[PDB]
Structures are given as C-alpha cells and as structure tokens.
Amino acid sequence: LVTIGSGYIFATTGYGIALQKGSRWKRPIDLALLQFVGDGEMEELEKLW
Amino acid sequence: EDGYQANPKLVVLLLNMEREWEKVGKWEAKSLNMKYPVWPRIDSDHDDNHLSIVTLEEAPFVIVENIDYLTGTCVRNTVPCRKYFRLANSTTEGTSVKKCCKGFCIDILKKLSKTVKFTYDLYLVTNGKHGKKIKNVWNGMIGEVVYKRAVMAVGSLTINEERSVAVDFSVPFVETGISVMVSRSAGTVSPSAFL
Amino acid sequence: STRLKIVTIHQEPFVYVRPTTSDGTCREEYTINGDPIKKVICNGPDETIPGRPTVPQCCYGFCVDLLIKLAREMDFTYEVHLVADGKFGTQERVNNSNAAAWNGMMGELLSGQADMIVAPLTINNERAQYIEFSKPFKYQGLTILVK
Amino acid sequence: AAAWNGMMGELLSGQADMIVAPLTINNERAQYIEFSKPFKYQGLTILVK
Amino acid sequence: SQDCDLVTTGELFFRSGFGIGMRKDSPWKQEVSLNILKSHENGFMEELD
Amino acid sequence: YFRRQVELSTMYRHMEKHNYESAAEAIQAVRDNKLHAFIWDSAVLEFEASQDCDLVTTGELFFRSGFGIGMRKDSPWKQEVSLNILKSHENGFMEELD
Amino acid sequence: EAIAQILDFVSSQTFIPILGIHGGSSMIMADKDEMSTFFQFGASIKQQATVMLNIMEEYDWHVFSVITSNFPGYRDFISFIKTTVDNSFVGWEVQNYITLDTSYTDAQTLTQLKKIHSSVILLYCSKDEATYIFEEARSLGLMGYGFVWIVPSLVTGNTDIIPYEFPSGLVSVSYDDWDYGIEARVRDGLGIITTA
Amino acid sequence: QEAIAQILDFISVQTLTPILGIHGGSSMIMADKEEASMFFQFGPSIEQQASVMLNIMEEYDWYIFSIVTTYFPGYQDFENKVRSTIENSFVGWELEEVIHLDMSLDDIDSKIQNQLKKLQSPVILLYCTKEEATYIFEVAHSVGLTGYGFTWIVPSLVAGDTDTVPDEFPTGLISVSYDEWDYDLPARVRDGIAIITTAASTMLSEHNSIPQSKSSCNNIQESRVYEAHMLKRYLINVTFEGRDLSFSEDGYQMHPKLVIILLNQERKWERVGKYKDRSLKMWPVFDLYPNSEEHKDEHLSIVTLEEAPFVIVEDVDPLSGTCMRNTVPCRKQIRPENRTEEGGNYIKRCCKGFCIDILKKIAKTVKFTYDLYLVTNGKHGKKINGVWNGMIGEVVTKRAYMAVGSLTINEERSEVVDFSVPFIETGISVMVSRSNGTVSPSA
Numbered sequence A: 001l002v003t004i005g006s007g008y009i010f011a012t013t014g015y016g017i018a019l020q021k022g023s024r025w026k027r028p029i030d031l032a033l034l035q036f037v038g039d040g041e042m043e044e045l046e047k048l049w
Numbered sequence B: 001e002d003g004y005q006a007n008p009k010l011v012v013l014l015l016n017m018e019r020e021w022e023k024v025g026k027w028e029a030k031s032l033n034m035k036y037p038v039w040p041r042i043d044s045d046h047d048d049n050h051l052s053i054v055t056l057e058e059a060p061f062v063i064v065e066n067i068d069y070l071t072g073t074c075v076r077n078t079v080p081c082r083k084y085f086r087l088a089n090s091t092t093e094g095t096s097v098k099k100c101c102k103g104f105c106i107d108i109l110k111k112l113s114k115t116v117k118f119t120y121d122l123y124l125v126t127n128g129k130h131g132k133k134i135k136n137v138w139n140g141m142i143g144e145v146v147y148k149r150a151v152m153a154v155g156s157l158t159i160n161e162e163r164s165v166a167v168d169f170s171v172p173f174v175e176t177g178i179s180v181m182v183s184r185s186a187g188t189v190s191p192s193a194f195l
Numbered sequence C: 001s002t003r004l005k006i007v008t009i010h011q012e013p014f015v016y017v018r019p020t021t022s023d024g025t026c027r028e029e030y031t032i033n034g035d036p037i038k039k040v041i042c043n044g045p046d047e048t049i050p051g052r053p054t055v056p057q058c059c060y061g062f063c064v065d066l067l068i069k070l071a072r073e074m075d076f077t078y079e080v081h082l083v084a085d086g087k088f089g090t091q092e093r094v095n096n097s098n099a100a101a102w103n104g105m106m107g108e109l110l111s112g113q114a115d116m117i118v119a120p121l122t123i124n125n126e127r128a129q130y131i132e133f134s135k136p137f138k139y140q141g142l143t144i145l146v147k
Numbered sequence D: 001a002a003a004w005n006g007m008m009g010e011l012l013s014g015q016a017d018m019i020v021a022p023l024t025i026n027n028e029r030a031q032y033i034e035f036s037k038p039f040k041y042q043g044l045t046i047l048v049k
Numbered sequence E: 001s002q003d004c005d006l007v008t009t010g011e012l013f014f015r016s017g018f019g020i021g022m023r024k025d026s027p028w029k030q031e032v033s034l035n036i037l038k039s040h041e042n043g044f045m046e047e048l049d
Numbered sequence F: 001y002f003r004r005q006v007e008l009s010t011m012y013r014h015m016e017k018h019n020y021e022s023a024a025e026a027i028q029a030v031r032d033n034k035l036h037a038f039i040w041d042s043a044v045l046e047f048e049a050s051q052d053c054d055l056v057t058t059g060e061l062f063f064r065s066g067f068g069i070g071m072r073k074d075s076p077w078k079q080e081v082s083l084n085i086l087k088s089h090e091n092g093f094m095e096e097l098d
Numbered sequence G: 001e002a003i004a005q006i007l008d009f010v011s012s013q014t015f016i017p018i019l020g021i022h023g024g025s026s027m028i029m030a031d032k033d034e035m036s037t038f039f040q041f042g043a044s045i046k047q048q049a050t051v052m053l054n055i056m057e058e059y060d061w062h063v064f065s066v067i068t069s070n071f072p073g074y075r076d077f078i079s080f081i082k083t084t085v086d087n088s089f090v091g092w093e094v095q096n097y098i099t100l101d102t103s104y105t106d107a108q109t110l111t112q113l114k115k116i117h118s119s120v121i122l123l124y125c126s127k128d129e130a131t132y133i134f135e136e137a138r139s140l141g142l143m144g145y146g147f148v149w150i151v152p153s154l155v156t157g158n159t160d161i162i163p164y165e166f167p168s169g170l171v172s173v174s175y176d177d178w179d180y181g182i183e184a185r186v187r188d189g190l191g192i193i194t195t196a
Numbered sequence H: 001q002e003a004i005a006q007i008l009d010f011i012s013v014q015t016l017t018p019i020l021g022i023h024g025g026s027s028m029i030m031a032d033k034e035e036a037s038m039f040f041q042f043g044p045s046i047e048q049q050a051s052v053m054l055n056i057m058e059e060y061d062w063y064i065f066s067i068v069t070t071y072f073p074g075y076q077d078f079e080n081k082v083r084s085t086i087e088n089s090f091v092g093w094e095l096e097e098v099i100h101l102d103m104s105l106d107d108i109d110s111k112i113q114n115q116l117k118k119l120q121s122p123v124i125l126l127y128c129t130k131e132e133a134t135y136i137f138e139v140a141h142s143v144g145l146t147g148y149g150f151t152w153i154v155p156s157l158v159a160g161d162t163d164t165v166p167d168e169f170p171t172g173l174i175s176v177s178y179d180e181w182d183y184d185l186p187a188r189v190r191d192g193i194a195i196i197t198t199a200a201s202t203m204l205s206e207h208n209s210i211p212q213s214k215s216s217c218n219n220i221q222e223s224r225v226y227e228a229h230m231l232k233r234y235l236i237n238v239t240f241e242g243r244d245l246s247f248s249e250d251g252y253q254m255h256p257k258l259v260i261i262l263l264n265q266e267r268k269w270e271r272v273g274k275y276k277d278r279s280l281k282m283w284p285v286f287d288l289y290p291n292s293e294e295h296k297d298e299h300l301s302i303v304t305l306e307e308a309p310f311v312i313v314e315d316v317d318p319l320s321g322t323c324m325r326n327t328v329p330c331r332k333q334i335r336p337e338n339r340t341e342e343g344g345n346y347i348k349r350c351c352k353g354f355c356i357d358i359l360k361k362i363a364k365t366v367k368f369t370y371d372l373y374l375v376t377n378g379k380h381g382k383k384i385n386g387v388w389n390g391m392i393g394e395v396v397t398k399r400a401y402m403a404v405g406s407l408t409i410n411e412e413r414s415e416v417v418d419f420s421v422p423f424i425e426t427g428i429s430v431m432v433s434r435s436n437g438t439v440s441p442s443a
C-alpha cells in the first residue's frame, strides 16, 4: 500500500485538543507545548510510535 | 496465623468531610472493591486537578489493549484506562474498566502530568466517536465537552471552523490530510525513445 | 478603524519586492494562470546603494494575495510596509540594559506601528508568549541548501 | 526473597568455590561476588532468519 | 527548483509551521483564523501555493 | 534489562511468556519456525550462526559486556587470575584460542 | 489496644484456649508467641497492607511514606513493603522510609519527612501517637492535598471517637460492627470449639 | 551602629555640604543615595557586594541558592541587581526563594517560621540589619537551616566590627568585608583629605572659583551653594597617591579594595581570600568546608590528558567568562617553557567529552566532589629505565587519587594501582586503505 504520488493529502490539517470555550488552560498550555515541539522527544515519539 | 478468618471480611472506610466514616468500599475474598469508581474531590475543585478527559482511540494517537488480568495490573509503560460500559437506555453510566492505553499522545499526556502539573481522569466516548453534528444536537467527545462531562477532549481529532466557534486548540502537532492508498505501477515509454 | 497597518518582509516566493516605475506605479504583469498579478505599493527601507532609506516599492506574491483575500473577507483597509532592520524577530538579552523581543519585524509590531504581520512568520513558543498567531497557512521543516 | 541460585548460588552456597563458564559480567551480580577481568566482549543480537 | 546549480540536503529537521501575527487584544484575531481555515478547506490555499 | 527498563515492560512480558530453559530449544524454535524471532548474546549465538546459517543475526549488538570468572568473595586468587588472563590476552593466548 | 496483649500473656502460661468477638480483643496484636495464645483479633498486617495496596492499586502509586512509628511490627511492616515491592510485577516504588516520635525533638523525623514529596502517607502508629501525628501533619503540610493517609486499626479502632485534629479524608479502615452482630460472633466460636 | 550614616544622609540633604566617612557606621552599606544628597561612604555599594557574593558562589560553583532578605533598605534592588547578574549568564543556576519579612505584632515568628520552613536550598544569601541577623540566625538554628551542607553568605553589613561576634551566627558563615589596612583613621582620613584637596585642585582648574560657603543650617542656604552641584563631579573624580578614591553613583567608593572573610572556628574572623580588580581570589583557607567529619565528601583530585573524541580540551570564550555548559574546568600550572622550574598559573582550558561525561554521571551517584587538572610530564604512563611517568606518577606521588582518560590497561599498572572495569572495547589496530578486488570467472 502506498500514498498518492508524493503523499500530499491535499487537505491540510494538524491535530487539536478541546477546551471549554470559557476555559483557557490552553493559552497557559501552549507555552509548554512549543518547547515540546522544539524538544527532541517529539521526534522520539515519532521514532517511538 | 492470627487465628483470624482466612478470607477477611473487610470493609473500606473513608474519613469523611464532616467527621464521618462514609463507606468507601468493601473487600470480598481476593478481589478489592470500592463503591465509587470515580475519585472523590476534596472540598472545592482546585487546580483543575483530575479533570475528566476522554481521548479517542486510533492507530495514530492512542491505542487500547486489556490490562494484565493475570496480575490484575496495567502495563508499566502504559496507562490504566477506563470507560463507561454502554448502557444508554439504562440509568447507569456503566463501567468499562481495566483497559491499558498506548501511543505518543498517551506519552504526551505523561509529559503533561509533569508539565502542567495536573492530575487527569480518562475515559472512552460512547455516542459517535469524533463529534458528529446532526440537527439540533452535536455528537461525540464534543458532546461531553459541551455537556460539562469532559473538560478537554484528546485524540486524532481534526480541526474545523465550527469546532472553533464552539471551542479551541492551540497545538497543531502533526501534519495530516485526506489521502488515498493505492497499489500502482509505472512503465517504459517508447523504449527510451529508441535511444 | 477600517484602515490597517501591515508589516511584511522580502522573502520569495511569499513576498517579492521590486522598484515602482518612473511614474510611481507598479508594472502590470501576468501570471501563468493568466489572472493579473495583484500588486500593492509597500513602503520600502534602505536600498543596496548608500542611504535612500525612504522609498515606495512594489510588493506581491503568496502572502500578498492572502492579505488581499483577508482584507476583502473581513472588510478592512490597509497600508503595507517592509520591516525596519530587515528581520523576522528575536529578543536580544543584554546589549546595554536587558532588552525585549523587539528585534527586526516583530518588535515593530510591539511598538504598535504594525497592527498585523503578514509574512512567512514561523509560529513558535517564544513568540506566542507575546503575540497572537492565526491558524498556520503552511507546514514546513528546516533543511540545508548546498552547491 | 532469594539468592540468585543456579550456578551463582551454588557459588554463594559454596557448592562450587569457583565458577568457570562463559558468563556475562553485570553490576546486579557484581555486588554479591568478585569477578575477574572479562575475556570476551559479546553483544546481544537477534539470531533468526 | 528554480536554480539547478543548488540542491537541498535530504534530512528535514525541526518541523515547524508559519502563521499570521497580531497583538493579543486584536479584534480581528477570531476572524483572521476562521478565514484561514475556510481558505484551506475551500481550496483557495491550494490555488495560491 | 527488561526488568529494569520500565520502558521495555511491554516487551518484558511479551518476551517472558515465550521464554525457554535453554539455547538448544530457543534456537530450535526459530529453526522449527515455532517462533519468528530469538533474542540472545553473541558469544554463544554467532558460533551457531556459522553452524547452520539459514538463520541470521540482525542489527547492532546492544548492552556490551566482557566475560569474567565468577567466584565467591574475597577469593585471594581472583586478582592473580585477572593477571593471568590479562597475560593470556597479552601473549595472544586468549586470542589464539578464540 | 494493650488489653489483647495482656490476655495473650495469660494464655501463654495457662494453655487454655481463648478468643474474642468484638472491640479490642478483635483488634490486632503483635506476633503470637511460640506457645499458642488467644488469637481472634490478629490479621496479617502484611495482608492488611495488601488490602490497602488494592486501594493503592486502584488510585495509589509511589506512596508518600511508610513509617514504623509505634507499637508492634515497626521492623515487620518495613519488610513487607519490600516484599510487595520485590515482586516487581508492576512498577512500584517508595519515597519516604523512616521511624520515630516521642523521645527527642520530633524534628529529626520531621526534617526527614519534609524531604519526601509523595502522594499517599502510610500510617502504622497507635491512635494516641496518631493524635500527635495529626498535630504534626498540619504543621508539616501533609494534611494538604496530595498527601492521602492510609490508616489501619491502630487508629481506626476508636470508631466511636475521632480526635477532631484528625485531618479527615484520609482512608481509615478496619472491621465494621453493623455488618456483623457482636453477639453473633460468640455462638459460632462456641460451635467451632465444639467441632474442635 | 548602622543608623548614624542615614542620619548623616539627612544632614547632607539639610545643609548641602559634602560629608564622607572613613570607618565604622559611616562606612556601612546604605540606601542608594538620593541624587540631591551629597555623601561619601567607606563601604562597597550594595550591588557590588551582591556581585562579590555571586563571584564567591561561582568560585565554589554553588549554582543553586536562595535569598532571605528583610524589609531593610536596598532589599528590592538587591533582587534586581541579582536578577540582572544571574540572568545575563548562560549558566542554568537556580534561584529557589526570595523572602521578605519583618517582625510584626505577635505572628512574625509564625509567619516567618511557616515561610522559612519551605526552603531546601544549600546556599543562602541573607540581607538585613546586624541585630536582625542575630534573630534570624536564632530562628535558623531552631529551623535547622544552619546545619551542615547548607551554607550562608552575607553582605558587608551583618559582619560589622571584627572584634564583636555573637556566636548566634553559625560557624562557616561566609561574608565580605573591607581590608583591615584600609580600616585605620591613618589612611582613610589621609585618603579622604587627599580627595578633598583634589576636589579643591579641580576647583582651581574647572572654574578658578573658591568652594568656600556659609555652613549654617539655621541660616538660609546660600544661593551659590547651588553651584556646588557641578562641584560634585570633581568631588566624585577624586584621586591621590596614584590611588583611586573614585566614587560610584550610590556614593560608595567606585574602586574599593575588598576581602572575602569567613568565620573561622570559634570566634575568629579569618580572611579566606582577597579581591583584586576584576578577578576573584577564592582562597580555600578552610580546606574542609564540612563540619564534624573529614571523611565525608572525600577529595579526589583527578588528572587527565587530551585525546579525541574521549577527552577534548577546548579554549573557553574569553568574552564569555568561564567554562560554558558541559565543559568542566581543568587546570595545569602554566609552566613557562623557558623556565626550568616552570612554576605555573593553572591553565583555563575546559575539558569535555565522553570521558568527562562519564565522570560527571558517575560522580553524581558517587556524590563525591573532585578537582580536575591536566598532566604535564610523561603523557600516558610510561616506564623509562627505573622510573614511571605520566598521570600514574601523580597517582603514585598521591598528587592524583584517580587518573581518568583514554588510558589503556596492562599488567604492570594493574600491579601498581587498582583499575576500574573497562567500559569500552579497544586495543592495538591498523588503519589503511585496500588497493584492489579479485576476479574469478565463475558465473
């Protein structure tokens, strides 16, 4: 089984997490997340899973 | 060896909020029983501690398998998981306990236990998987986010504007799009144009 | 105010920057598709030649077409200029007194001179702590260019 | 709770004063007993085809 | 792709995504994203790229 | 390693449930094709790899270790032994035997 | 609490079978002597802890502290935790592991206790000691969230009376009277005697 | 007494006549001088002292610290000065807590005790009045904060007079103070007067105008007293004997000699070290910084040699002072090549790599502190004639306890010194390139 051509999906999106509209644990949550992007582990998780 | 009943007849008692030993649970034979599956919250909610959250299970983000019932325990590098055994018609929510969860989201959640320092409760959705909107009322994890059953919903869920009016996400961790997997082949044209 | 201030930066193919014509307007050009290439007059900073910091120039490209769409869609007017000191934006810790993330294009925004940044501006934790980023137009990763 | 037994416990036990075998050298064992300098440096691989 | 005398190294690292920028109290923030999402779903974004 | 590596707990059990009393049976399972894969150290295994060879070793050796004699503590000879085997390396004896 | 031991002492000399159906006699006691004694109250404290562990298994991991503070099994309780941990079937671990109370400044134990930072406090001290411990915990900050208390019969025994200062919400658990009648226990035992 | 200087600041404000002081209370650290006020204090600026505290901590490489302060003057800035000084540096040192407290009503002890009890940090900077220091120390003695492994560091004010020291202060207390030679009327006045005459010298040069003014507070201040304002700069720029009295904006001397002092056993104040210019002389006067037992945290001076990849010597940034991040310092006396004796200033090149990393990892488990330097003579241990050479010599001379590096193992060295189990596979080998491939027609 293979992807289409190169594999560009043609629909562009990334995963997201819900929060109560009123809730903003996310603005605070965001900061932790980026460094996580920057951190090598995302790629470890990539390699992991 | 204490001359005591071999199978202890035991009951679990919690020191209650107002000087009371509310019956936390009872112990019968080998099995351990707690009357309330959910963990009680002391006083007022503090620090969004143990916020309820259900993460959708899929190959990409989370994965569920049974706990090692031979030991009665969940795998060390996984997370012990719960769900509500379906009983929609029934008054009871139902209990779908003892299932372990895997995946990088699960691992991120571990990162988050430490990072945002917040305890969490995780369960599985029953009606509709990823939110489905039909007529007046929406369905899925989004429903439990709207109903106040769930604070945050986690999974392979895609982002859309409608979800955006209702709720929000600031992460965008992985690149995903609609796609097709085909078994296909390519072939020579004009025998290298006869050289 | 309907009128808006936009700061951008030279970075092909998202933002091309060319001199206006003698009469001060942008040369009419056509894309491969055949639709007229939309251009906007963007204040330009210092040129390759000595001095000449103040200039009127022509801007167009991916990000410019996006701006035009956003402006038409949310119904707002704007004025575009190229960022002072030619940079995207990073905080500098200790040049004399402790300093902010006022470096390049990003600081300009902090000052309030620019009300919106429309360019290939990477969304990251450092910047998100101080400004608001919209949903990312594109997903990209760093690579290496060689001969 | 028990001694490692087998070849090693017999050794602790004194059944065999000295153990001559192709045995890998590790810290968990090492606290309990003295070990000579290691003769070979073999590494785990997966033997299948 | 435009200059054939130049080439990229194969590895892609530090995966990251670009975005529009506004002050946190901008009244156009809610509108700016909804528009971006609509353009992605509509295909406008694909036309430009 | 699987024990201490909580990271490998999954694998620890996955592995445990299929374990053998000895190499003869463990090699045989792969040979018999009862088990698709077998995990063990190099000194005992490679010689067998040469011996039959239908089977193959793969990847990079992990968790390196050097073989040594095991003796009860305080053995007044271990040190001498160490010197002796050291000499065995020095004079190429160890090497010659291998 | 003391009463059981006393009657037990009589048992060692007399050799007359004795048992008890309610209250303190039913309450646990230190390890039985080689000569058989009276013994209905006693239960494997280890077992008792495994009961508690089941609760810990459901909601408790990396317990804050297990301390051999007072009465029987300070040394004995210490081993089992190790025995429980020794199986290594799951991923168990400990953070706090000390003893002591009354003889000197509580502080040597307290400063050590300050060092531990964990989820569930394990208690093996009498209600009297516990009374003081309650006083200690409030100053200590153990009473605050993230420091659950696991309490045995050592304290739990006074069902009728709970020291107000007892920072509630921590699990206190032992046998309950309504479930089984006190009078009910005696006939059965008599029957057992008959069958013996 | 500290308060006298403050009163004098008020007086400066009142009469606009320059005043300075060479000893004692006038000398003690004070609140940043109001700009209008004109005054001279014989002590090192609060910021400067904080800097010295940081240098001292850096010298012993105590990265993790907390600050206990009181509402006493300059407390807020102290935090600010530290925030800049600590912040600028690349290193990841940690500030644990900052505590601001005062005794109010009947609960200051409760509140202070509850507030102080949380702290766990090894290195404490304290700032307060001397007496307050007495109370805080009694409280610390109750709290157990004074005891071994925790250490306290103090600015000038608490030490006060050298002669008087309530033993309420814990021993091993580390604090900064002015040089004793400086603390004599003889020179502080000689110096002060010289400063006055140089200020007057500049009265001759700048404007050819007499500085003399009516001194009475009761009488209306002279209008031409105003001019003295400009006169202050000359005042600030005062030097004599080729020595700087130069002040700083706070009014403390701009370049004042200073000594690192510790409380020696019992009642003695012994200067552990001395500070000259930019450089810090962290002198280990007290070799054993550990109370009760010499054996605890046993010293393990270590010698190594540079080889790639394992042990790599790198030159530290000149601008970015001291080793950065991972590199660990290694010093070998800078032996002059020309000098036969070759007595040397220890080198400042940072060793880093796999060998260093292994030591760093092992050291944490071991929890033993250590000093690392580079070998000079013989490189890898060698037996030449009847005598050994290299790091092994320093192991034999007991100039090194343990030697680390790419060092191989052999029977002779195992005979003379016990060796760790080898962590790597190595040996003799060859490095060359193959010329060609053989063809056999066997297809």
Ligand SMILES: *[C@@H]1O[C@H](CO)[C@@H](O[C@@H]2O[C@H](CO)[C@@H](O)[C@H](O)[C@H]2NC(C)=O)[C@H](O)[C@H]1NC(C)=O
Residues within 6 Å of the ligand: H237
């Ligand atoms: C303190 O005063 C001395 C003496 O005037 C200053 O040294 C002179 O600085 C001037 C700057 O214009 C130079 O031209 C002279 O060459 C220096 N030495 C002389 C005058 O021979 C010094 O600069 C002053 N310190 C400060 C605060 O700058």
